[PDB]
Structure formats: structure tokens, C-alpha cells
């Protein structure tokens, strides 16, 4: 199985740098892109950049150009991210994830760091939360600021669930396709600019934050999240 094993929590002071690692196993390291994602309280998920360990080429969200540096070591199958000029804004959990043909299906467990664009596609999720009773069905909406339909015929919309204290997990890829290992109680539909995740027969394991994300164009972008909880 694919494994991404990240380095430990860091407690650091402002104005310093930190370098964290993501050790890969169970697949050919130099064949796939690795992306990095920032989870900061109140700020959902934010995409930093990606790196191809075969070519060593990296692509960054402009917002992180001069903040984050991505590298890779093919001898140890390890990807690294270094952050400079640390500030309170950088306190967050940082994930690496393997890009499998646009699917972020494999995630590291995250590294916690505690510090003591106009043309970007905007993804919106109108509901901050949904409150449901077990066995109920639920719908969660998302919208994109431009069509996510590609010339190849695929619509590059993705749904993730981040259960409490866990890494995000991929549920639905390319708008409607069910990810491996996910129950078929989850389904996705959409128009290319508006999307719906449907969950039948909700159960306790479904509790967490649901995020939509586009992987059409750099920088990749996430919706603001919709928290699912069991009822009052």
C-alpha cells in the first residue's frame, strides 16, 4: 500500500525557518507529483504547491512564492517543505499528498507547526454546516467560479472528507467517480459550475468537514468546507 509518513510536530518561534519531511513508500516515488496542503484553523484547506520527484520541477501557489520551498531526495524517497520567516499565520497542520492522475487519494498524517490571485478559481460552499440524525440522507453544495470541464471531457471537481483528528480523504473524483474504499452511500453530481455531494444513510463515521476542490488549473483551490455533525 502507498504510505506517506511525515515528520513530527514542530514548536517554533517567529522569524525562523522550519523544514519538514514526507517519506514515501509503496509506489514509484519518481513517477507521481506530491502536493502540499495547509490546514489552518478558520481557513479550511489551502494548496501550497507541488513537486515532481523525477524532474525536481516544482509549481507554487503565488501566495507561497517566497514562503515555501519544495524539494525531494530520490535516495530516501522523501519530499521536503521548508518555510521561511515564520509568523503566526504559518501555525497550521501541513499535509503531503500523492497526485494519482489528478486524484489526491493518498495523504500523509500531517505535520503540525506551532509558531509561538484574481484569476484563481474560487470554490464556494454556502453552508458552513449540516446537522443530521443517523440514517438521514444529506446534500452538500459547492460552486466554482468557472467551468471545471476540460477539453478531454472530464470535470475536475473533487470531494474530500476530513474526519475529526484525521487527514483528508478523497471521496469523489472528477465530479462523480467513487474513490476506492469509499462506500457507495456517497455520490456526486453537478453541472460543471455547481456540484452536489449526496450521502445516504449517514452514520457516525461520516462526521467531519467536507471540502470540494478543483484540480483543473494551478493554483488548486478548495471550498470553505461544510461541517457535518449529528444532531442537537
Amino acid at each position: 500500500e502507498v504510505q506517506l509518513q511525515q515528520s513530527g510536530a514542530e514548536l517554533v518561534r517567529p522569524g525562523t525557518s522550519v523544514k519538514m519531511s514526507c517519506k514515501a513508500a509503496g509506489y514509484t516515488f519518481t513517477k507521481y507529483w506530491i502536493g502540499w496542503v495547509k490546514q489552518r484553523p478558520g481557513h479550511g484547506l489551502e494548496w501550497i504547491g507541488d513537486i515532481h520527484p523525477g524532474s525536481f520541477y516544482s509549481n507554487y501557489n503565488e501566495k507561497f512564492k517566497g514562503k515555501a520551498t519544495l524539494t525531494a531526495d530520490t535516495s530516501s524517497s522523501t519530499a521536503y517543505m521548508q518555510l521561511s520567516s515564520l509568523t503566526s499565520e504559518d501555525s497550521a497542520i501541513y499535509y503531503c499528498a500523492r497526485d494519482y492522475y489528478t486524484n489526491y487519494g493518498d495523504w500523509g498524517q500531517g505535520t503540525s507547526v506551532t509558531v509561538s490571485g484574481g484569476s484563481d478559481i474560487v470554490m464556494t460552499q454556502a453552508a458552513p454546516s449540516v446537522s443530521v440524525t443517523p440514517g438521514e440522507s444529506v446534500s452538500i453544495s459547492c460552486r466554482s467560479s468557472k467551468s471545471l470541464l476540460h477539453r478531454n471531457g472530464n470535470t475536475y471537481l473533487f470531494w474530500f472528507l476530513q474526519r475529526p483528528g484525521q487527514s483528508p480523504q478523497l471521496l469523489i473524483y472528477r465530479m462523480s467517480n467513487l474513490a476506492s474504499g469509499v462506500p457507495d452511500r456517497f455520490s456526486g453530481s453537478g453541472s460543471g459550475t455547481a456540484f452536489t455531494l449526496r450521502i445516504s444513510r449517514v452514520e457516525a463515521e461520516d462526521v467531519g468537514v467536507y471540502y470540494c476542490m478543483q484540480h483543473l488549473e494551478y493554483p488548486y483551490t478548495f471550498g470553505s468546507g461544510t461541517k457535518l455533525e449529528l444532531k442537537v
Binding site: 507521481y32 515532481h52 523525477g54 520541477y57 509549481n59 478531454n152 475536475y156 488549473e217
Partner: peptide
């Protein structure tokens, strides 16, 4: 798999 962008 393109070596310079992960974009489809």
C-alpha cells in the same frame, strides 16, 4: 504523466 505540471 507530465513532468512539469500536474494539470490535466
Amino acid at each position: 504523466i507530465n513532468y512539469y505540471a500536474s494539470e490535466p
